[PDB]
């Protein structure tokens, strides 16, 4: 159990090191908002006394980060808690931790390479190789080595869905 949380900490610390080294500024934005945004989710609502008005817990920091980029801070990131007032299951908890970063003069192609380098580098640094063993159904089931060797496979939503369905979709 200890080892799992040591690994969790190593993951977060690795990401901070990765982004700091790329010239990102670590920032903090509001967890209480007049208007929640940046994701699709049911929000938590709370009453703030001194301002005599309801506030929402953030579901994401996205809109604040973009405003900071408008402000002239070209590279920003935040690793912090978000809150989604939704259901609990194997992969969802109402409060969970995310990293968001925003990079001026980059597009999505750039973020794919950066994602590949960050994730593959993370797995390799922490586990010693690109391949990690995973039991999708727990130890009672079969295990699979998940291969994080870049580059990652790419598929296009609409085209691949067309192939998968065996039918042409609308333009």
């Amino acid at each position: 159990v200890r080892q799992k949380f040591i690994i969790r900490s190593k993951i977060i610390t690795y990401i901070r090191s990765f982004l700091d080294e790329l010239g990102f500024l670590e920032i903090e934005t509001p967890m209480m908002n007049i208007i929640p945004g940046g994701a699709v989710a049911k929000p938590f609502i709370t009453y703030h006394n001194e301002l005599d008005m309801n506030l929402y817990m953030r579901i994401a920091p996205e809109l604040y980060h973009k405003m900071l980029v408008v402000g002239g801070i070209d590279r920003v990131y935040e690793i912090g808690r978000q809150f989604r007032n939704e259901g609990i299951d194997l992969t969802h908890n109402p409060e969970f931790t995310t990293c968001e970063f925003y990079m001026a003069y980059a597009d999505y192609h750039d973020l794919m390479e950066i994602t590949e380098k960050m994730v593959s580098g993370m797995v390799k640094h922490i586990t010693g190789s690109y391949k990690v063993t995973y039991h999708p159904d727990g130890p009672e089931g079969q295990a699979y080595d998940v291969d994080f060797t870049p580059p990652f496979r790419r598929i296009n939503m609409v085209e691949e869905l067309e192939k998968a369905l065996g039918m042409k979709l609308p333009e």
Binding site: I6, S9, K10, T13
Partner: protein, 31 residues
């Protein structure tokens, strides 16, 4: 042999003075 006289330190146990101390350290898990 001359008759026994207990040491002035009491005779219970060897003097054991309190010495200066230094909080131990744990290693950086990230290192």
């Amino acid at each position: 042999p001359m008759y026994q006289v207990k040491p002035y330190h009491g005779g219970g146990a060897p003097l054991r003075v309190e010495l200066p101390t230094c909080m131990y350290r744990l290693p950086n898990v990230h290192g």
